[PDB]
Design goal:
This is part of a larger assembly, with 4 copies of chain A.
Chain A lengths: L10 H18 L4 E9 L5 E9 L1 E6 L1 H4 L10 H12 L17 E6 L9 E5 L23 E5 L2 E10 L8 E7 L14 H10 L1 E7 L2 H9 L6 E2 L5 E2 L8
Antiparallel strand pairs in A: 1-2, 1-4, 2-9, 3-8, 4-7, 5-8, 6-7, 10-11
The structure holds chloride ion (CL) (3 copies).
Chain lengths: 247, 99, 247, 247
């Protein structure tokens, strides 16, 4: 046989490159996944991740209460945190024994898979009673925030898209929904009459994941890296795997 | 169970399918640790090898009003990826032939 | 001096082989131990080991209740497990909140040291109220199960004997005793009048050990291997140390 | 065929009678069980049963503390009952908050299977520090109480033997052991050199059972009757099954 890494007859080499290219390209096909992640960052350094993976389109919608830190199998001040909720919903509405709940998120990162069309991304960032813009009467139910998404890049390839916003003020009390549509450069509308019932089935077939990790380090090591997920850490470091035309 | 017109489905995480005994002890702290060790090998600090809350089997039943050729299933791993990595995952399999 | 590993003058070599041979042979003398182990396997993957080590003869006898999983310093559903016991002793005898107790053993392995005579082994596998065979009136108090014992072998040597039985059915609810006699190829009966009071003292001098290990891996690593004990794991892999005529 | 219940050709009839006779007689063979039960009766009407079933000989030995009522999975005044024990072991030895512990047995019934030889029965009824007769120096380690055993009879057959004694006084604070030997009308001593090691194995193969039943009615219904055990209730009513030459 020819010697490794010296000729066009390195079939092991060509198959390795095709294997990676086929993964990249399958994800961008209408057969492929589109994925969103919401990261809620808490003051104790823990991070709630909510992930949803679906065909055609994907989203996450969470109330103010659901985004608050919950420590499975530990004390959570559950009665005082009910009172905190009442005082967030209406000023002086509650009888809490604290000024600031450390369960309130300090920041949100939204990440989309590279199979999203960025121009389709929509976000409903509500107040604590789940109204998008002060009163329902004057609320557009979303904003198109795609222009704010940064490219997460590894070895020159886009491995994902990031929108990050801090909530560092006492008045940053939010409900949150985000939505994006899978890339579709074709003129076959996946929601046209032929395929619309498959999009309805995709809503039921979407898989959800949620978990609180103790630290960004544990999130990078045990959540992002093992699953070949894209990520952007507090130090602006990009994580993910470049696949297109790569060994 | 879910009952609807036109189409119907159920979607559950690994955690949501684990046994929960309403109004009894559930080892809730140890079962958090079990979840960490299922999501990533040696990721947790649980005091047991096997959680008895893990399902031993699944039966899926459809009403006779279903079209069997339309049935689709997404059987994911414990971090809710259909087929090892998202990049290579078809979001479902058509399992009607097995019903 | 002669060079190592080249002649009959390697006294370090000859003494190493004699040291191992003397251990093997001492164990098989009437001065030596005979040992039994009962392993109760639970559905959470934990394993209760009961061990007894004695001169001349050895056994273990446990009730249905004593073989159930007990987690030292954790919750055990102790009131519900009383009710489980009542419903096992008599059909519909209890008021338990579960169909199947996960504290019930899923399997039993009985292991004897290689110093046992296999033809002497006796087992009383009772029902949950400690009757060997349905009713006391028709019960032989034991079965001679030696023919079922497999040889645990390492490097061609018998390091122990294993009898394994699963309890995978809802109706596998047992009490258990097992007994074996130390090898005695001589015509000196260790229970003859000369030595019978020494056998009575052996019953009092027998040492017992019991512990629940979290996994078969922990049992192999921290119980079987450090003590040079024989074992057979779920994958039919043999553990123990060959000693006869070996360095 | 001949008509049922009209001739010596009712083989179904003859086999039914032999089946029952064979059970009766097997139990009385040297191959058969000998069984003892100790019933501890408490003031709340509950009953602790301890049972042991063995070849050749059988016994039960319990401390003062072990005979006290224990309610699995309920409160037991465990600290106060430690103090009760100290005040029972030595007058004014403890700091209990009660005059009389309701955990103290009010009575004991000892029952033997019909395979016992009554002349072999021995009892060590100790004081609360486990001395048979006031001081060890002057203690015979047992009394032969066989003469006190009543015959439990059903349909004219002995189905067991009962010794009952009340403990109704504040000073009735006991430790207890009882022992009996299987019938042996032959001149083959089961403890002679030929078989003595089998008697040693019988000590290890003996099966034990213990449980607290809520009432004598529950004991009769779910313990005595289902297992074809002999019993004598508070109203002097005999329970058990006659087998010898019976259909
Ligand atoms: Cl496509
Ligand atoms: Cl010897
Ligand atoms: Cl006989």
């Amino acid at each position: 046989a020819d010697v490794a890494g010296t000729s066009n007859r390195d079939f092991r080499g060509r198959e390795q490159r095709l294997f990676n290219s086929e993964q990249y390209n399958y994800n961008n096909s209408l057969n492929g996944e589109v994925s969103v992640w919401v990261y809620a960052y808490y003051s104790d350094g823990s991070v709630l991740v909510i992930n949803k993976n679906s065909q055609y389109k994907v989203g996450i919608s969470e109330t103010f209460k659901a985004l608050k830190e919950y420590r499975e199998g530990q004390h959570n001040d559950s009665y005082d945190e009910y009172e905190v909720n009442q005082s967030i919903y209406y000023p002086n509405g509650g009888d809490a024994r604290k000024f600031h709940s450390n369960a309130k998120p300090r920041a949100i990162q939204i990440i989309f898979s590279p199979s999203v069309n960025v121009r389709t991304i929509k976000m409903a960032k509500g107040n604590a009673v789940s109204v998008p813009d002060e009163y329902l009467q004057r609320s557009h139910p979303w904003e198109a925030t795609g222009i704010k998404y940064r490219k997460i890049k590894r070895d020159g390839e886009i491995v994902g898209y990031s929108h990050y916003f801090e909530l560092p003020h006492e008045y940053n009390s939010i409900s949150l929904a985000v939505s994006g549509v899978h890339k579709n450069p074709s003129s076959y509308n996946v929601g046209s009459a032929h395929n619309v019932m498959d999009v309805f089935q995709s809503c039921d077939l979407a898989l959800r994941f949620c978990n609180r990790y103790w630290a960004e380090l544990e999130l990078v090591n045990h959540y992002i890296s093992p699953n070949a997920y894209p990520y952007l850490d507090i130090n602006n470091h990009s994580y993910g795997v470049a696949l297109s035309n790569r060994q």
